């Protein structure tokens, strides 16, 4: 079973450095070119860099040449991406991907594809400081009731939300984050439930903002009377 786990990354100041790592297993790392591909928020896929399997050769997109350095350790099944002199344009989700490069008599003809991808890690390049979010309940003051949690004032992205520790998944809507004029993100997570289950069935949102090490459980119920 092919596995690629990415580490490092997160938040960094412009001009500073970050180093990504990609740990690999379940395949013959010695026979595969290993790559970095990134995606700017809401934008398309862009190839960043490649490392050949055994000859030590390295390849870069024009956008990153000189600032970024890919390297590998076959004896350890690890790919690294040293990212120096970071810019706002470097803000993106970075994926490490195993590539397949094919048998051509001469060059000029190429078949390069990415058959396995890591989950991806967000790299934010900003002067703004890490802030943990506040978690507030969203509750009503017909047959269907809506409940939720407002995850307000955090930086950088991302946050994750589950309900009832993952036991409640149907009717869940976790909205894309909106950046407020303050330079802090905010997001809401909601769930629709039968009105007759309120004060009978307990509903709790589990929020996690790994960048600030914040983990909150908030009960979403109507205001007591």
């Amino acid at each position: 079973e092919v596995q690629l786990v990415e580490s490092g990354g997160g938040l960094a100041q412009p001009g500073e450095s970050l180093r990504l790592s990609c740990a690999a297993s379940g395949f013959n790392f010695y026979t595969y070119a290993m790559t970095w591909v990134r995606q700017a928020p809401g934008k398309g896929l862009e190839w960043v860099s490649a490392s050949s399997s055994t000859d030590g050769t390295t390849y870069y997109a024009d956008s990153v040449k000189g600032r970024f350095t890919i390297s590998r350790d076959n004896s350890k099944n690890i790919l690294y991406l040293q990212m120096n002199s970071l810019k706002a344009e470097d803000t993106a989700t970075y994926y490490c991907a195993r590539a397949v490069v094919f048998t051509d008599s001469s060059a000029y003809y190429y078949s390069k594809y990415f058959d396995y991808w890591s989950q991806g890690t967000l790299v934010t390049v900003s002067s703004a400081s890490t802030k943990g979010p506040s978690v507030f309940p969203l509750a009503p003051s017909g047959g269907t009731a809506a409940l939720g949690c407002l995850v307000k004032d955090y930086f950088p992205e991302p946050v994750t939300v589950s309900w009832n520790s993952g036991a409640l998944t149907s009717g869940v809507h976790t909205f894309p984050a909106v950046l407020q004029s303050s330079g802090l993100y905010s997001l809401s997570s909601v769930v629709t439930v039968p009105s007759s289950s309120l004060g009978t069935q307990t509903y709790i949102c589990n929020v996690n903002h790994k960048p600030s090490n914040t983990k909150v459980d908030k009960k979403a119920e109507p205001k007591s009377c």
Binding site: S51, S52, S53, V101, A107
Partner: peptide, 9 residues
């Protein structure tokens, strides 16, 4: 395959 070679030449 190129057996892991990204580019040849």
């Amino acid at each position: 395959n190129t057996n892991g070679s990204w580019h040849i030449n």
